[PDB]
């Protein structure tokens, strides 16, 4: 724990806050919330404020469905760009059946649910330490995004100087005050694609931060009059934005993946995570890569992975094993992207990893020789299977896979699937402009 009630009421009073958002994340990642006047705070912290439950199912929701709203006393965070009528603050609230039971179908709880298996399984903390990249567009007078990059930058370059620009700064330094912890940052590979990195934390505390982040960027990026966008592969033929995910299974304040006395100094345990994850690679792809565009981001070349294989030195692999050991021995999974619902990506990544540690699987052999010099049919001879080519070729793998269907419950697995074939189906019955640049003059 961190803040007790009298600690929150001490700041509402002192710091003087007049409004309180009660955040919670839905099924498609949209960060939603009901909003209560500071006048109601009491009733809230007693866990009594209620809302239409179906709002989480997203668009495929169907019935008013009363849900109560427990505020994680600790998440409390007061925004600074607010003044004017009192300040504003937010409690990320877990969800609870009208008879006080957790709501099986809320992303966030489901993670606490799967990390239950994790402590039921002997482990102490399953640490995420994300690398969320992004893009910035220059708003139009009508205050609307455009296809205009905020800069013509490149890799780690001295992106827009100390002079006037660097939204990264206003973006970075801002996050400082709010209690964040930024590793570093640097301009990324494509013109106006920047990257910020925090320090690691248990999945709960972290996926809460990817959400908060996405807020603070999008809202700080606007003060600067520039569109921010975590979309996956916004432009065609330009670096996609990805959400590199760094996983470290501990046990006894001790990094389990570590084993000096061994090969790569990876614990046999760490081989179980890495192997088990390679199995359902293409299965949970649909989730960590939940959108239609992710697949225009999953093209060979732009440094974005496609093929299921692991190493520590190879271009665009699916699982990467960073070089630093000791406490920092971690299994980076590079297929994820910002579109991905944090709580949902972790649930499937961990569970897919926690499969390997309870049926003790066998890592297949790292690919260092290279797959991008091999052909599709050649890599196929070994444990190398391409990733899907669509949110659709993927859904057929996330459905088929009985274990993911155990990371997302009969409820969440259903409505995630419910929703993504109306998505995919919305995008396949359309008649895009390329289809005119191809078939109107010729045919």
């Amino acid at each position: 724990a961190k803040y007790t009630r009298e600690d929150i009421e001490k700041l509402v009073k002192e710091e003087n806050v007049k409004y309180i958002r009660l955040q919670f994340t839905d099924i498609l990642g949209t960060i939603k919330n009901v909003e209560i006047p500071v006048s109601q705070l009491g009733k809230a912290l007693d866990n009594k404020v209620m809302f239409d439950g179906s709002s989480i199912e997203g668009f495929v929701r169907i019935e008013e469905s009363d849900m109560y709203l427990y505020p994680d006393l600790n998440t409390f965070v007061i925004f600074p760009w607010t003044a004017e009528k009192g300040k504003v603050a937010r409690f990320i609230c877990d969800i609870y059946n009208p008879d006080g039971t957790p709501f099986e179908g809320d992303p966030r709880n489901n993670l606490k649910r799967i990390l239950k298996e994790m402590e039921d399984l002997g482990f102490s903390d399953f640490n995420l330490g994300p690398e969320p990249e992004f893009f910035l567009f220059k708003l139009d007078e009508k205050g609307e995004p455009t296809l205009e990059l905020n800069d013509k930058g490149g890799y780690f370059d001295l992106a827009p100087t100390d002079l006037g620009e660097n939204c990264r700064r206003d973006i970075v330094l801002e996050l400082e005050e709010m209690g964040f912890e930024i590793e570093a940052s640097h301009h990324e590979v494509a013109p106006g694609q920047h990257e910020i990195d925090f320090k690691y934390a248990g999945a709960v505390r972290s996926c809460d931060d990817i959400q908060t982040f996405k807020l603070v960027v999008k809202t700080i990026a606007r003060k600067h009059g520039l569109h921010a966008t975590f979309m996956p592969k916004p432009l065609f033929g330009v670096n996609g934005s990805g959400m590199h995910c760094n996983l470290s299974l501990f046990k006894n304040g001790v990094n389990a993946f570590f084993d000096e006395n061994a090969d790569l100094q990876l614990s046999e345990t760490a081989k179980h995570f890495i192997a088990g994850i390679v199995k359902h690679a293409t299965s949970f792809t649909a989730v960590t890569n939940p959108t239609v565009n992710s697949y225009k981001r999953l093209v060979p070349g732009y440094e974005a992975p496609c093929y299921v294989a692991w190493s520590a030195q190879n271009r665009s692999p699916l699982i990467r094993i960073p070089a630093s050991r000791g406490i920092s021995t971690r299994v980076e999974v590079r297929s994820v992207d910002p579109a991905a619902n944090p709580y949902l990506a972790l649930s499937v990544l961990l569970a897919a990893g926690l499969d390997g540690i309870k049926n003790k699987l066998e890592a297949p052999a790292p690919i260092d020789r290279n797959i991008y010099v091999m052909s599709k049919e050649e890599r196929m001879e070994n444990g190398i299977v391409d990733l899907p080519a669509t949110l659709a070729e993927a859904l057929e793998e996330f459905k088929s896979n009985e274990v993911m269907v155990k990371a997302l419950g009969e409820h969440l697995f259903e409505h995630f699937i419910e929703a993504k074939e109306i998505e995919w189906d919305m995008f396949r019955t359309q008649v895009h402009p390329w289809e005119r640049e191809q078939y109107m003059s010729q045919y």
Binding site: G58, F59, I422, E423, M426
Partner: peptide, 15 residues
Amino acid sequence: KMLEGQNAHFRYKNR
């Protein structure tokens, strides 16, 4: 029935 308003319920959710 519901499939036309939902059909609408969805059109704006997805635009």
